[PDB]
């Protein structure tokens, strides 16, 4: 019935966390949305604040490493950064993978953090229209 999308960024901190938040809202009807990373950097407080601004609560999200069982059941694995794309483990044959590159918002001025958040919204909206 429900399909599964898996958002991956290096530390499961900013990009993948915002993508999970947007995904649960926009694709929530027929999609199970999860996020992971190559390493765990913790859920960025700025990502929680960025999502709170658009009335999406991601405060209960966790920073997790990639799980082989979630990978196995994924219909689409989406990598959100170059490092995550290149270091993503060998995927099961039936699982599709796409790289949706976004700039690293961590280290950028607060306005640019919000810009990346909204670029992610747009990519997820376009995905729903496929």
Q: Shortest gap between Cβ of 20 and K ion (angstroms)?
A: 6
For the segment 52-111, give every residue that binds K ion (CB under 5 A).
64
d(CA 59, CA 108): 21
Does 13 engage in binding with K ion (CB under 5 A)?
no
Q: Which of 8, 9, 51, 116 is catalytic?
A: 9
Residue (64 or 109) nearer to K ion, CB: 64
SS3 118: helix
H-helix segments, 1-67: 15-26, 45-52
- The verdict on whether 14 is a catalytic residue reads no
Tell me which residue of 4, 121, 1 sits closest to 74, measured CA to CA.
4
35 has binding-site annotation: yes
CB within 8 Å of 45: residues ≥ 6 apart: none
- Give bridge partners of residue 108 from the DSSP assignment: 106
Q: Shortest gap between Cβ of 54 and K ion (angstroms)?
A: 19
40 has binding-site annotation: no
Binding residues for K(+), by number, are 12, 35, 62, 64
The residues carrying an active-site annotation are 9, 81, 88
Give the footprint of K ion on this chain (CB under 5 A): 35, 64
């Amino acid at each position: 019935d429900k399909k599964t999308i898996y958002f991956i960024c290096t530390g499961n901190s900013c990009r993948s966390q915002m993508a999970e938040g947007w995904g649960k809202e926009i694709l929530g009807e027929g999609w199970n949305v999860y996020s992971a990373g190559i390493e765990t950097h913790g859920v960025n407080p700025k990502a929680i604040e960025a999502m709170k601004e658009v009335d999406i609560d991601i405060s209960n999200h966790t920073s997790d490493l990639i799980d082989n069982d979630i990978l196995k059941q994924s219909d689409l694995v989406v990598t959100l950064c170059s490092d995550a794309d290149n270091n993503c483990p060998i995927l099961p044959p039936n699982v599709k993978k796409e790289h949706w590159g976004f700039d690293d918002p961590a280290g950028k001025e607060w306005s640019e953090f919000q810009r990346v958040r909204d670029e992610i919204k747009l990519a997820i909206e376009k995905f729903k229209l496929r």
